[PDB]
Every structure is written in C-alpha cells, then in structure tokens.
Amino acid sequence: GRDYEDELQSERDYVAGLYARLDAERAQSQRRYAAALREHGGTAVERDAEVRALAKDIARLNVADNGLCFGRLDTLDDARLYIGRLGIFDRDNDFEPLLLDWRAPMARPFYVATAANPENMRRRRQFHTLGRKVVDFTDEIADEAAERERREEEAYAAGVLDLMVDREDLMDDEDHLLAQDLIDAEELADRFK
Amino acid sequence: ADVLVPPQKQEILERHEAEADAIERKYQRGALNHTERNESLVKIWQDATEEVGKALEEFYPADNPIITIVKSGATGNLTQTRTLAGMKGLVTNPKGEFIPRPIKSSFREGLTVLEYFINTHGARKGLADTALRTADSGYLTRRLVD
Amino acid sequence: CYGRSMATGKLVDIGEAVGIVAAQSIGEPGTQLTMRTFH
Amino acid sequence: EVVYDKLSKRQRLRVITHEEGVLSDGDHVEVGDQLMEGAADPHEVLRVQGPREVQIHLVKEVQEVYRAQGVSIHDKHIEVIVRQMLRRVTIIDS
C-alpha cells in the first residue's frame, strides 16, 4: 500500500532516530564508566558504586538493541503513546514520553483487546520488526571429595589471613579495621568460587 | 577568599531541579516506574555536577594556590576541588545505590544536617571496605607467589 | 628473553628472582581495583 | 561448515570494527575470531589455536584490565605467571 508504505517508512525513520539516540547514550555512559573506572578523583566506595551503576545502565541499554519498539497505542483523544522494551524521553521537551516501558501503568493498554471495550485507545499497531527495521502494520482496534575441597579452601584462606600483619605488629597511625575482623576464611573462600 | 564559588551555579541547580520536577510528574502520571525514575534523576544530577566542574575550572584564576597545587600534579584532583567549592553531589545508600536527593552544598557554603547525615553511610562503608580490599590483595599475591 | 630488570635499566643478572617480583608488582596495586561487593 | 546457533539474544554481537556496527553477513572471519562480545574460553583457544594464541590472549586481557583502572605494569611480569600454567601435558596416548 502506498499509504502503508509511506507510514512504514516514516515509522522506520522514527525508530532509526530512537536507535541513534540510544547509541549516543551508550557511548556517553561507556566513556563515563571508563573515566570513573580509571581515576574518578574520589574514594573507593563512590567509584565502585558509580561503576556498578553505569554497568547496569549499559546493560539496560544493550539488552534492547534488537526489537526495541513493540508497537503503538494511538488513542481516541488524538494522541499517541509508543511502546517498547525500555524508557526514552526527550530531556528537553519536558520529558514528553516517546517510548514507555512495557511495564509502565500507562502502557497496560498494550494487552487489553476486547470487543469494543477500550480505555481510551482507538488504533493499535504491533510492529513486526526483525531487530532494527519495521515490517508489518497490525491493526487491532559422591560427597567425599567436596568435603576435602572445601576444607582445603578454608585452610588456604585462613593462611591468607594469618599472612597479613596483625594489630600486635602494626606500624600505622591508629588501629584501623583489618581483614581478620570483617570476614571469615570460609566466606573468603565462598567468594572465590 | 581563595576557595572561590562560581556564580553560574544557582541557575544550573534551578534548571536541573525543574527537570527533576518534570520527572516527578512523569512518575505521578503513571508514565514511569520508581527505579527508572531514580536512574533518570541520577543522570541529570551527574550532568549538573559535570557542568559545575567545568564552570568552576573555567572561572578560577591561573595563579590560585589550590588550582596550582592541583594542575602541577602535586596533590589532588578537580573532584575534590569541585566538592570543596561546588557541590559534593549525589551520595550512596548503605546498599551502594545512589540517592536522587543530592548534596547541593559544598564544604565551604556549609552543609546542612540532612545533607550531612547521608554523607556518613559511604564513609563508614569505605573505612570498612579498605580492609577487605587488602585481604583480597594479599590472597591474590600469596597465590601468585605460590 | 626477560630482557632488562626495570629497576636497574640494564640486562638482568643470572641468579635473579623474577617470579616473585612479578607477583609483588601485580598484587601491590591490587588495592586500586574494582572488587566484587561484600553485602 | 561449523555452526554456533545457540546464541542468546542477551548478548548482541561482535562490533565489526571495519573503518563499527554489529558483525555483518558474508564477512571474512579467521580461525581465531570471536562471534559475540564478551570473553572466550582459554581452553577453547588452546584446543583450536594452540599454546601461542592463548598465552597472548591471557596477557592481553589481564593487562587491558590493569590498564583501564589507572595502573602501569609491564608484560614480562604477566608472562612469568603464564609460563607456569602450560608446563604440563595431559596424556591421551602414552
């Protein structure tokens, strides 16, 4: 269809813009996480925290890099509310919703399909995108070893701890916290397996 | 009187607080979820801290004692300086997670109380993590020597 | 094959220990890294 | 022809890096090539490449790790911990 074709192409341009936005945020978060990993200026805790956070972010981004948009919910009230497997908003235009998350409460009317009982939805298009390009318009109006293993690991970690200096031998400003009183050999073993 | 505050700072904070208000709306309007909201706020305030940093080091003179102590690689970073004259910024829960309520006050303008009762969590967390770090290091080292 | 001992700047001397130096060089800055959490 | 068709949708692909997008189709890939962004198996590399591409792999990975965190170390100190991991052979045929 000529109209189907023009639409399909416009929606493809829209999704390509969304994907370019995504790629930009991806490079941004990557660079930020890199330069926080290297120096970060501050101290450990904040550095590790920022790192884990930007890692979660890079995940949340990449996880949806193939099949981001799920469809549309053009509403009765001359208004649209696109959908996808992520959240994307125009930080400038007062966070107008360009792409809700499939979990949101405003995106529950992507799974209610009745015999003319819509909340405020009139048209509904479930796109058959492959990974990055829209195709369809779809209107829907031996418990012996383990013992010795674990015991040898416990003993190795106990030796590790006995290896570090102790408070009866320190040469520091004031008695601070030490490995020997925050974690036990057995957890220092669990956390390397 | 040598620890200088940049004057392009309050504009910044009001702008970004307006953005945060918009997000609060998008949360109350059923258009978003809690944790993604907090992530968005985090993004915004990190951007604001970066802006503050660039403005600060665009405003300080070239002969200032602090900037000279830093730029000569002797001591410190521009994060310490930003926090001493700009805004400490976001801080962490005891679970590592960030908080969307930042610290918009520096160690010169003077912190408030509740902008000071959330700055402890990470401090104690770090003063305890140091020892475990030393322990894992000793472990790796004893192994590599074995 | 080793080359020069970075401490001296000249070639390495027979009888030197170079398996310990490596472990120390490595595990000294191991504090400056991003370990897993502890919760 | 060999096939690795159990490829989770979670991991995306290898970025082609041909001057920058997802790995293409009908593209050249060598014996020692990856097919999904992440980390390989040193044992895989040893069974399919040998004791000269797995040592390099280990050194490269360890040093890039130590390099993205503000640290400076040589490689003749990593290549002394590796040499001590391929000095023994499991004997299939006596």
Ligand SMILES: [Mg+2]
């Ligand atoms: Mg001291």
